[PDB]
């Protein structure tokens, strides 16, 4: 009915043993996109570009619901609870509701704007439960539910890309009509809901290692293996020899080991002290990249690698880490104090440093003549016996990604962080049903071009159940914990200021507790 | 439904033996507060102040329902019945209803204001039943239900304070988002209700003592105890002696007693005959106060003490009594004839006078040389064997307060009067759901800033069941009763005037019947 509410405001968190259930409700507004039309888009329509930036695709009159960020579900305090008390977590169940739909019509006279209710208009909503549409979630896009529950947000417009040759299309390109799906139609008084079960995924590692991969031995006992220690008796000619020694606590670098650090793809090193950087432009020319069909793409963020060495936190890889913007930061050429650079220093115990060579390999045969020659390894692929950690997740970062439907993949954990699934939470698509203005009184076969100006508003609720993996550490000394600082300040961190603006002052990871290797 | 009422007007009182049930219904209006925003506030945002007045906190877009005053429930005649016939009363049950919701939208053109119904808008309401929010009830604030049932009232805005250092915040400060609670959403056609059981509390003493604590003896019989009556035989040197006498009806001041008057904290004395006061400014400098973290707060009203001696009703303690304003009284520097000063003269039989010393103590050892020296006690804490009465309640005064959640407290009766509870009636919070105006037709990630101007109106009902404690006195002569005066006047007391304004001409306490000690 018109006078009865279709749902209530549900927003809290329940901590139930080894489960936590988060619930979020937000207020959304949806405009009419594209004047109800499907439009072909390309870099031709955007004004042209280089070959690396060419594309072809379509924008649709539909919008979509995205909640693929952790702050859509966790408050900062709840995130603190989770990361300070658990070794792991993963999503299990999802429930989604859309309710209290209101459709408004806008009339603009010469000098006045009037907004009225349209009680008989509809919104169309459907889920892509069979994964038949291009999946644009999982590209770290704007338009998710806002972190602050009081913020009213605008629903982003749906569009997609297909195969391109420059700004042109090939015969293999696909065009999708979203009206060619069955969808539910809602007047003011109807609601929509659905449930979803997550795939079985591994727990995320919300811990750091308290041991290093090269320091796993007993520091008191020798090995029963020998290593070559000398090849010449001394100075002079014809001094060749072979001497062997026991590998022990005095020489840990030469001990035999069972496991080796994971793969690498070297990045350029950039200092936040700008005077230490080379006085030249190297953002694009000095960057690591990969090529596909003649197009170059930045290797960003790339394989999970440690950001810097010990004591070198002023250095960061060129495109090897996630960079978030601070509240109120612009979009073009902002200074370093306006952005937030994450660092994966916790994985330095298993993962190679991002701005270093993996190691050295022999490159010749020494003989009595050529000396022994070695070469640097700048990119090392997977080898048997390698171990590594994945990239951390953040309160501001993405949760899941869709694994591409391919013949083969390896370790399909998404490179920007999170859970990779073949059947992720489905896309939820929404659109205001077009309402024509007065048609002519003589028949015309052309499609109608005049429409009543409308938009819609409502409430959306998402509830996720997460499974937790508790710590049972035997460590004696206290752990490192995420904490607020007592020292006085003008504002409270993770709160509003005097003007009403909510901000997140820093990125928060998940790795504070410790575990052995 | 839109065309059906959600509740009826219920407003009366039922006297049922040892119970009385009061019911009140009022009409309320709720605006949009803060433009739907949370704002940080401080004395910095208020313009600065002294150290004693610094604060830090937040204002919210929510309003709240308060009925923590006796005239919200009792008519003057019902109050007369209660206080003239009972030794005690206390609250037992509460029922709360919110109904007949109407949401209106306001459109302001160049020179005209139009108000229309918005049939599809919602109000959000919830109770803080777990006491998780700062409890701002119990600070004697404006914004309660009006005494006169025909008055339409405006719902006050919710705000709270947290820890401050000057105008700055510390890391211990808490920020609360009220959208982070589950709440019920109501369209025009929905209603809300809940029930609450009061904690077990002692009966309020609606009586005065007909005996004095120093006059509890039989005036005809001697004691079997002696007191020292003489220490010198007479005039001259070396006349020391020890003489003892029986304490009896001729010397009542020296009799042994089992119980002593309650505690004290001396106040400065102010005369309503201004020419008797000192010709200087002493409102702040001469006031009693307590210190907390370097901040001074007025001791107001402080411990329950008798206002004045016999025959000195022109004197009142500086900040030791509740002062109410008369109808139409301003807020800054009004004259004494514009305010109503209560007096706790009924408790002079057990409680010390507010503007006097508690007594005298010895301060040395007399010997044969030093004479006997005594000193005044200006503040006396609790001693075993002390008895006292609490502050009276008034028809205009507060009913209950929340006892702070602390390790320890003593006699947690609220100092401004009433019933102290660990789980008082919960706070009831209400807000108009924001309705965005027309959003742009291109996606923007910023939160929406343009909203439709709305407000809401409705009916609220509160029903309280109170338990009574009847008198079974054996007193022969008639009691003192609260009564109206027959003498003619321009208006009727506790009624409206020719312009429609209701007024309460005087404060009415509860202590008219008498009881023995």
mmCIF file of C-alpha atoms in Angstrom, chain A residues 1-5 7-13 23 27-34 75 78 99-102 104 106 112-113 115-117 119 142-143 148-157 188-189 455 457 459 484-492 494-502, chain B residues 1-2 36-42 45 56 58 61 105 107 109 117-122 124 162-163 165 167-190 431 433-448 451-452 454:
data_model
loop_
_atom_site.group_PDB
_atom_site.id
_atom_site.type_symbol
_atom_site.label_atom_id
_atom_site.label_comp_id
_atom_site.label_asym_id
_atom_site.label_seq_id
_atom_site.Cartn_x
_atom_site.Cartn_y
_atom_site.Cartn_z
ATOM 1 C CA UNK A 1 0.000 0.000 0.000
ATOM 2 C CA UNK A 2 0.877 3.665 -0.412
ATOM 3 C CA UNK A 3 0.588 4.479 3.298
ATOM 4 C CA UNK A 4 2.449 1.466 4.712
ATOM 5 C CA UNK A 5 6.205 1.071 5.035
ATOM 6 C CA UNK A 7 10.702 -2.367 5.512
ATOM 7 C CA UNK A 8 12.592 -1.183 8.559
ATOM 8 C CA UNK A 9 16.054 0.274 9.104
ATOM 9 C CA UNK A 10 18.437 -2.556 10.055
ATOM 10 C CA UNK A 11 22.029 -1.592 10.817
ATOM 11 C CA UNK A 12 24.184 -3.263 13.496
ATOM 12 C CA UNK A 13 26.633 -6.120 14.071
ATOM 13 C CA UNK A 23 23.892 -5.434 8.582
ATOM 14 C CA UNK A 27 19.431 5.711 1.428
ATOM 15 C CA UNK A 28 19.890 5.832 -2.344
ATOM 16 C CA UNK A 29 18.820 8.065 -5.220
ATOM 17 C CA UNK A 30 18.568 6.913 -8.839
ATOM 18 C CA UNK A 31 18.246 9.321 -11.785
ATOM 19 C CA UNK A 32 17.281 8.610 -15.370
ATOM 20 C CA UNK A 33 20.473 7.733 -17.238
ATOM 21 C CA UNK A 34 21.152 8.350 -20.943
ATOM 22 C CA UNK A 75 32.364 0.179 11.284
ATOM 23 C CA UNK A 78 34.053 -3.533 14.410
ATOM 24 C CA UNK A 99 12.413 -1.218 0.013
ATOM 25 C CA UNK A 100 10.468 2.012 0.614
ATOM 26 C CA UNK A 101 10.525 2.990 -3.060
ATOM 27 C CA UNK A 102 9.558 6.588 -3.850
ATOM 28 C CA UNK A 104 9.247 11.632 -8.020
ATOM 29 C CA UNK A 106 10.128 17.028 -11.772
ATOM 30 C CA UNK A 112 10.566 27.378 -10.782
ATOM 31 C CA UNK A 113 11.219 23.678 -10.139
ATOM 32 C CA UNK A 115 8.894 18.016 -7.396
ATOM 33 C CA UNK A 116 5.843 15.812 -6.891
ATOM 34 C CA UNK A 117 5.078 12.180 -6.145
ATOM 35 C CA UNK A 119 2.317 7.102 -7.159
ATOM 36 C CA UNK A 142 33.390 4.407 -7.113
ATOM 37 C CA UNK A 143 29.694 4.241 -6.308
ATOM 38 C CA UNK A 148 28.930 6.544 7.041
ATOM 39 C CA UNK A 149 25.363 5.205 7.461
ATOM 40 C CA UNK A 150 23.847 8.710 7.382
ATOM 41 C CA UNK A 151 25.165 9.573 3.896
ATOM 42 C CA UNK A 152 22.675 9.487 1.020
ATOM 43 C CA UNK A 153 24.305 8.122 -2.116
ATOM 44 C CA UNK A 154 23.629 8.184 -5.848
ATOM 45 C CA UNK A 155 23.435 4.928 -7.809
ATOM 46 C CA UNK A 156 26.177 4.603 -10.471
ATOM 47 C CA UNK A 157 25.393 4.051 -14.144
ATOM 48 C CA UNK A 188 5.607 2.498 -4.085
ATOM 49 C CA UNK A 189 4.520 -0.279 -1.761
ATOM 50 C CA UNK A 455 13.904 9.984 -10.412
ATOM 51 C CA UNK A 457 14.778 7.122 -3.960
ATOM 52 C CA UNK A 459 16.384 2.230 1.226
ATOM 53 C CA UNK A 484 43.694 5.018 18.753
ATOM 54 C CA UNK A 485 46.121 7.597 20.123
ATOM 55 C CA UNK A 486 45.169 9.454 23.292
ATOM 56 C CA UNK A 487 46.918 12.718 22.376
ATOM 57 C CA UNK A 488 44.511 15.622 21.963
ATOM 58 C CA UNK A 489 43.416 16.854 18.540
ATOM 59 C CA UNK A 490 40.916 19.197 16.918
ATOM 60 C CA UNK A 491 38.769 16.312 15.634
ATOM 61 C CA UNK A 492 38.140 12.671 16.485
ATOM 62 C CA UNK A 494 36.767 8.357 12.032
ATOM 63 C CA UNK A 495 34.134 10.965 12.897
ATOM 64 C CA UNK A 496 32.549 14.088 11.430
ATOM 65 C CA UNK A 497 34.020 17.581 11.613
ATOM 66 C CA UNK A 498 32.227 20.846 12.401
ATOM 67 C CA UNK A 499 30.826 20.972 8.849
ATOM 68 C CA UNK A 500 29.379 17.455 8.923
ATOM 69 C CA UNK A 501 31.936 15.691 6.712
ATOM 70 C CA UNK A 502 32.954 12.151 7.639
ATOM 71 C CA UNK B 1 -3.958 2.840 5.321
ATOM 72 C CA UNK B 2 -3.939 6.505 4.351
ATOM 73 C CA UNK B 36 20.317 15.829 8.076
ATOM 74 C CA UNK B 37 23.952 16.082 9.248
ATOM 75 C CA UNK B 38 26.044 15.197 12.271
ATOM 76 C CA UNK B 39 28.141 18.167 13.377
ATOM 77 C CA UNK B 40 31.010 18.406 15.826
ATOM 78 C CA UNK B 41 30.417 21.138 18.403
ATOM 79 C CA UNK B 42 32.561 22.752 21.083
ATOM 80 C CA UNK B 45 32.241 26.557 17.664
ATOM 81 C CA UNK B 56 33.346 19.006 23.105
ATOM 82 C CA UNK B 58 28.164 16.316 18.725
ATOM 83 C CA UNK B 61 19.797 15.209 13.135
ATOM 84 C CA UNK B 105 6.712 18.925 2.259
ATOM 85 C CA UNK B 107 7.916 24.521 -1.289
ATOM 86 C CA UNK B 109 8.666 30.089 -4.466
ATOM 87 C CA UNK B 117 1.250 16.029 2.033
ATOM 88 C CA UNK B 118 4.016 13.555 1.203
ATOM 89 C CA UNK B 119 2.158 10.256 1.493
ATOM 90 C CA UNK B 120 5.222 8.063 0.839
ATOM 91 C CA UNK B 121 7.696 9.587 3.317
ATOM 92 C CA UNK B 122 8.815 7.909 6.533
ATOM 93 C CA UNK B 124 12.338 6.530 11.930
ATOM 94 C CA UNK B 162 32.181 13.525 25.433
ATOM 95 C CA UNK B 163 35.665 14.019 26.879
ATOM 96 C CA UNK B 165 40.584 19.150 26.743
ATOM 97 C CA UNK B 167 37.814 22.753 22.963
ATOM 98 C CA UNK B 168 39.842 19.759 21.724
ATOM 99 C CA UNK B 169 39.090 16.046 21.943
ATOM 100 C CA UNK B 170 41.248 13.232 23.298
ATOM 101 C CA UNK B 171 41.620 9.708 21.950
ATOM 102 C CA UNK B 172 39.199 8.438 24.597
ATOM 103 C CA UNK B 173 36.330 10.506 23.149
ATOM 104 C CA UNK B 174 33.420 8.548 21.678
ATOM 105 C CA UNK B 175 31.492 9.336 18.506
ATOM 106 C CA UNK B 176 28.040 7.768 18.159
ATOM 107 C CA UNK B 177 26.088 7.333 14.929
ATOM 108 C CA UNK B 178 22.378 6.891 15.603
ATOM 109 C CA UNK B 179 21.804 5.367 12.159
ATOM 110 C CA UNK B 180 23.897 2.456 13.479
ATOM 111 C CA UNK B 181 20.844 1.282 15.440
ATOM 112 C CA UNK B 182 17.880 -0.720 14.133
ATOM 113 C CA UNK B 183 14.793 1.489 14.022
ATOM 114 C CA UNK B 184 11.195 1.190 12.883
ATOM 115 C CA UNK B 185 10.156 3.087 9.753
ATOM 116 C CA UNK B 186 6.650 4.550 9.657
ATOM 117 C CA UNK B 187 4.598 5.870 6.771
ATOM 118 C CA UNK B 188 1.276 7.638 7.310
ATOM 119 C CA UNK B 189 -0.738 4.658 8.475
ATOM 120 C CA UNK B 190 1.813 2.971 10.738
ATOM 121 C CA UNK B 431 13.854 11.486 12.799
ATOM 122 C CA UNK B 433 13.920 10.135 6.718
ATOM 123 C CA UNK B 434 15.820 12.313 4.208
ATOM 124 C CA UNK B 435 14.264 12.581 0.753
ATOM 125 C CA UNK B 436 16.744 13.735 -1.917
ATOM 126 C CA UNK B 437 15.825 16.276 -4.558
ATOM 127 C CA UNK B 438 16.491 15.501 -8.223
ATOM 128 C CA UNK B 439 20.029 14.111 -8.646
ATOM 129 C CA UNK B 440 22.178 14.926 -11.686
ATOM 130 C CA UNK B 441 21.999 12.720 -14.765
ATOM 131 C CA UNK B 442 25.751 12.014 -14.704
ATOM 132 C CA UNK B 443 27.226 9.976 -11.873
ATOM 133 C CA UNK B 444 28.838 11.867 -9.006
ATOM 134 C CA UNK B 445 30.400 10.050 -6.061
ATOM 135 C CA UNK B 446 29.895 12.835 -3.505
ATOM 136 C CA UNK B 447 27.084 12.467 -0.996
ATOM 137 C CA UNK B 448 23.872 14.242 -1.913
ATOM 138 C CA UNK B 451 17.003 17.605 -0.122
ATOM 139 C CA UNK B 452 13.273 18.225 -0.147
ATOM 140 C CA UNK B 454 9.995 18.256 5.049
#
